[PDB]
A = this chain, B = another copy of it.
Amino acid sequence: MQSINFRTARGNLSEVLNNVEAGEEVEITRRGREPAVIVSKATFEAYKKAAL
């Protein structure tokens, strides 16, 4: 799981989304803020489905 800061994610979002499409889970971090994870919709939906 790659972990990138906000500035990097905004300037390289296309490359972020390409990695995500390839199955990768990308963590976006901000100073003093909780991290966010960008994941393929299909993967996300499968996880939630299995959880439910």
* Distance between A6 CB and nearest chain B CB, rounded to angstroms: 7
User: CB-defined interface of A21-48 with B at 8 Å, one 1/0 digit per residue?
Assistant: 1000101101001111111111010111
Are the C-beta atoms of A34 and B42 separated by less than 8 Å? yes
Distance, CA A48 to CA B44, complexed state (A): 9
Q: Which range contains the number of A residues in contact with the other chain?
A: 20 to 34
Q: This chain: how many copies in the complex?
A: 2
A20 → chain B, closest Cβ, in Å? 5
What is the chain B residue whose CB lies nearest that of A9? B13
Which of B36, B38, B40, B51 is close to A21, meaning CB atoms less than 8 Å apart? B36
Given A9-B13, A17-B28, A47 and B51 contact (CB-CB distance below 8 Å): yes
